[PDB]
């Protein structure tokens, strides 16, 4: 029964890790979009005139 117990623990922890990775991916995508906008603003409204 120790195999059963450790299997339950392993599957639960794997589910938690998967959820965390997905959330991190979404947050990274949003941050990348915002930073692209910031880079465009830096290139346009500083090195010239808008």
């Amino acid at each position: 029964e120790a195999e059963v117990q450790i299997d339950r623990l392993i599957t639960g922890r794997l589910q938690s890790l998967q959820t965390y990775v997905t959330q991190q991916l979404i947050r990274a995508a949003e941050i990348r979009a915002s930073a692209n906008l910031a880079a465009t603003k830096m290139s346009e409204c500083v090195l010239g005139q808008s």
Partner: protein, 49 residues
């Protein structure tokens, strides 16, 4: 007219080309060089004007 959008400098024109799974832009740009130093002045008044 937006600075550094396409090209590095003042933009003249571009030519598109295909790729396996994308596009390639060839930008033509104009860049000054061979500078010289001079003495300036804001405005010049003659006969009080």
């Amino acid at each position: 007219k937006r600075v550094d959008f396409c090209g590095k400098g003042y933009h003249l024109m571009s030519f598109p080309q295909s790729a396996p799974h994308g596009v390639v832009f060839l930008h033509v740009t104009y860049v000054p060089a061979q500078e010289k130093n001079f003495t300036t002045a804001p405005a010049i008044c003659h006969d009080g004007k």
